[PDB]
Amino acid sequence: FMPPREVHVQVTHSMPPQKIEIFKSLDNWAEENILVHLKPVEKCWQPQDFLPDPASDGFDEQVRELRERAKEIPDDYFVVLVGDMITEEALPTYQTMLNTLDGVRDETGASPTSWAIWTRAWTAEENRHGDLLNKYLYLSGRVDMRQIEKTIQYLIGSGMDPRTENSPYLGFIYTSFQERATFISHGNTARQAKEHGDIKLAQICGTIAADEKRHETAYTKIVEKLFEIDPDGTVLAFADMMRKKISMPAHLMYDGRDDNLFDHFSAVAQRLGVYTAKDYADILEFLVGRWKVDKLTGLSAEGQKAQDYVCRLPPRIRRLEERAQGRAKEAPTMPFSWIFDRQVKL
Amino acid sequence: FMPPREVHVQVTHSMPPQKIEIFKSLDNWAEENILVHLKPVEKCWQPQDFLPDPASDGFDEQVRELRERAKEIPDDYFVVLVGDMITEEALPTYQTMLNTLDGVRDETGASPTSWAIWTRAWTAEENRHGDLLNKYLYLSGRVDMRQIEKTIQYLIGSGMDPRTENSPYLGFIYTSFQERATFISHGNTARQAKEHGDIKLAQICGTIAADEKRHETAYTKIVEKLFEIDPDGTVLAFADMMRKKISMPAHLMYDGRDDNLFDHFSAVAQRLGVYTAKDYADILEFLVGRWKVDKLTGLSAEGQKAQDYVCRLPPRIRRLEERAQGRAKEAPTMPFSWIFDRQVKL
Ligand SMILES: [Fe+3]
Ligand SMILES: [Fe+3]
Ligand SMILES: [Fe+3]
Ligand SMILES: [Fe+3]
Ligand SMILES: [Zn+2]
Ligand SMILES: [Zn+2]
Numbered sequence: 001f002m003p004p005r006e007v008h009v010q011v012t013h014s015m016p017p018q019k020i021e022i023f024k025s026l027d028n029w030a031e032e033n034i035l036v037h038l039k040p041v042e043k044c045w046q047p048q049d050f051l052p053d054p055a056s057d058g059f060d061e062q063v064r065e066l067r068e069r070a071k072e073i074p075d076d077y078f079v080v081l082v083g084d085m086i087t088e089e090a091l092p093t094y095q096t097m098l099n100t101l102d103g104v105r106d107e108t109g110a111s112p113t114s115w116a117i118w119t120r121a122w123t124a125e126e127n128r129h130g131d132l133l134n135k136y137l138y139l140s141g142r143v144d145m146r147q148i149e150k151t152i153q154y155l156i157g158s159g160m161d162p163r164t165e166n167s168p169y170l171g172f173i174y175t176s177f178q179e180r181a182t183f184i185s186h187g188n189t190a191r192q193a194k195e196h197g198d199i200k201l202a203q204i205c206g207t208i209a210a211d212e213k214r215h216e217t218a219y220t221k222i223v224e225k226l227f228e229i230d231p232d233g234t235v236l237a238f239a240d241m242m243r244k245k246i247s248m249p250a251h252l253m254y255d256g257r258d259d260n261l262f263d264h265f266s267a268v269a270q271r272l273g274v275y276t277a278k279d280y281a282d283i284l285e286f287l288v289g290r291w292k293v294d295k296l297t298g299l300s301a302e303g304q305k306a307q308d309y310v311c312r313l314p315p316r317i318r319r320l321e322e323r324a325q326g327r328a329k330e331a332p333t334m335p336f337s338w339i340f341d342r343q344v345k346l
Numbered sequence: 347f348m349p350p351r352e353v354h355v356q357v358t359h360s361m362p363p364q365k366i367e368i369f370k371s372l373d374n375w376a377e378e379n380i381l382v383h384l385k386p387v388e389k390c391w392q393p394q395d396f397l398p399d400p401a402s403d404g405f406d407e408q409v410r411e412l413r414e415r416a417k418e419i420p421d422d423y424f425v426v427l428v429g430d431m432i433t434e435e436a437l438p439t440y441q442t443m444l445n446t447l448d449g450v451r452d453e454t455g456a457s458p459t460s461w462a463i464w465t466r467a468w469t470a471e472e473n474r475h476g477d478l479l480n481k482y483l484y485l486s487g488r489v490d491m492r493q494i495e496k497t498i499q500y501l502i503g504s505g506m507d508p509r510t511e512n513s514p515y516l517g518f519i520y521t522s523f524q525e526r527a528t529f530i531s532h533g534n535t536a537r538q539a540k541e542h543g544d545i546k547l548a549q550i551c552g553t554i555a556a557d558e559k560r561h562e563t564a565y566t567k568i569v570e571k572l573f574e575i576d577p578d579g580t581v582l583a584f585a586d587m588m589r590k591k592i593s594m595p596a597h598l599m600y601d602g603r604d605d606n607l608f609d610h611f612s613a614v615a616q617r618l619g620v621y622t623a624k625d626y627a628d629i630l631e632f633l634v635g636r637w638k639v640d641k642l643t644g645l646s647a648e649g650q651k652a653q654d655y656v657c658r659l660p661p662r663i664r665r666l667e668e669r670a671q672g673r674a675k676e677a678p679t680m681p682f683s684w685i686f687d688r689q690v691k692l
Pocket of ligand 4: 472
């Protein structure tokens with residue numbers, strides 16, 4: 001039946017028109033400072049590096065092993081991993097999302113601009129994450145590929161509205177935050193697969209995280225350059241995003257069966273510690289430290305307000321969650337269509 | 347090393363600005379006439395419907411069968427199928443490509459416009475094609491998934507410039523043509539897999555073709571509505587596309603090894619009859635018949651020229667190829683990295 005829809009009213013082009021040049025001029029900078037964070041394709045890993053080799057005499061035992069190993073991984077973990085993969089699979093959305101950003105958008109799909117080249121290349125690198133996880137999940141035999149496939153269709157057709165308002169200020173702060181968010185997630189699913197005694201699974205999550213660490217560096221560099229060129233406007237963007245809260249890229253998630261699928265998935269991510277509310281705050285605190293927002297001069301009346309709010313927010317959010325956490329009650333066990341309606345503790 | 351790049355000079359916004367409304371107003375029409383050609387997600391097939399069931403006691407024998415069956419399929423066919431799949435996999439490009447089209451582009455990634463909803467939904471349906479083919483190819487064990495994965499990365503990062511110039515006139519004629527092109531391809535790979543005695547493979551190609559037939563109907567309806575609303579401009583678009591020739595969506599194809607990969611792939615598609623130059627002309631002739639271009643009144647000096655040229659082109663192209671075909675010499679055998687450098691006849 002009917003999937004979820006963005007409840008917030010839609011806003012387009014919140015950025016002043018003239019300033020687009022600030023991104024048209026930074027073309028040279030981008031080549032020297034963002035395009036370096038790209039791996040040449042020949043040097044890149046590919047999903048096959050991490051999956052059974054179908055053209056190998058060892059393919060059968062390889063798959064048989066992957067599957068033995070999988071049994072020892074509990075369902076809750078699978079639910080999280082699946083959510084992850086579904087997010088990663090909705091990639092066509094995210095390339096489209098970067099092609100709405102006013103200062104950078106690829107005008108033809110093959111535009112030689114540094115910004116477009118970065119976009120096409122980043123998409124290319126991300127495409128690997130979906131594939132690798134998909135085939136791992138598929139072979140594992142622990143999840144319901146059909147329902148997962150269905151969720152993905154519902155997701156791609158729903159789209160996303162990250163409320164970036166076509167602003168590269170907001171957009172690049174979003175991606176900055178998101179890329180770090182998945183990085184923490186993946187590193188935890190890595191660290192947790194290690195614990196469940198599956199190193200080959202750890203490696204999968206591991207090397208995806210690698211890509212995210214690199215992408216995050218690229219985006220945290222673009223924000224750093226915007227803090228120097230436009231100290232006030234960047235602070236205004238950074239504050240604006242924090243008040244709206246960062247709505248995750250896969251929140252319209254729907255399996256034809258759970259009207260609050262994303263909330264439930266996120267709850268399982270929480271209990272296991274793949275991505276907690278602490279992590280959310282920790283990311284923020286890191287970005288304030290990374291951009292040295294604590295120390296900036298030349299701020300307008302609203303800018304100083306936009307600064308202080310942002311700077312005091314991490315200990316605030318942490319403590320907000322703190323007391324919510326030490327009052328949270330026992331959560332119910334709920335079925336997930338991703339796992340044939342087997343039940344995990346929320 | 348370095349992939350191929352678009353040799354033609356880039357052109358943006360070839361459409362007059364005012365007319366965008368003709369696409370802003372057709373929002374209602376689109377809901378009644380294009381959105382109907384969408385399958386509800388619950389009714390859609392998913393790749394799992396066509397692949398071994400990893401959560402089934404039968405998974406092992408299923409895979410073992412898929413693989414036995416594959417051996418009987420010759421390498422040349424695999425090369426074509428692989429090209430196909432690589433094209434289909436570069437999907438994020440094509441969603442981006444539809445979001446450059448001036449009259450339809452999704453402004454936020456979640457815009458409630460009939461045009462955006464169609465875009466997100468079509469992308470969602472297409473995502474299934476890549477997956478299904480990918481996993482089939484993977485399990486088969488007859489192709490080199492790593493090299494295929496690499497090609498895909500080179501492709502997504504290269505992008506495409508279909509020379510639609512942000513015009514929905516040109517763009518929707520392009521997609522109209524492309525969707526029919528893949529339809530003929532897939533139906534032939536279906537019909538050919540039948541012949542090599544693999545019905546489960548035929549079914550895969552079969553049900554993908556199904557999606558393409560539907561998409562083609564939707565797009566050939568949008569052109570039909572543009573032939574009625576703007577008889578002259580549509581003919582001008584249709585002529586313009588034919589003179590530039592339709593550059594296929596996967597032409598920048600590169601495996602780090604073959605500087606003319608796309609030409610060689612296309613040559614194998616040709617020899618086998620998956621997609622010949624005849625087919626190209628046959629599609630054209632069908633579209634002239636489909637849109638009744640043969641019979642249109644009220645055409646400008648250039649429009650009548652744009653009409654006649656287009657109408658006489660199918661027997662022209664066919665005969666051009668005819669004599670090229672009856673003079674073509676024996677083609678060399680060439681290695682493909684998609685098949686571990688085994689060699690097929692071009
Ligand atoms: Fe990713
Ligand atoms: Fe990412
Ligand atoms: Fe397709
Ligand atoms: Fe298609
Ligand atoms: Zn994918
Ligand atoms: Zn895909």
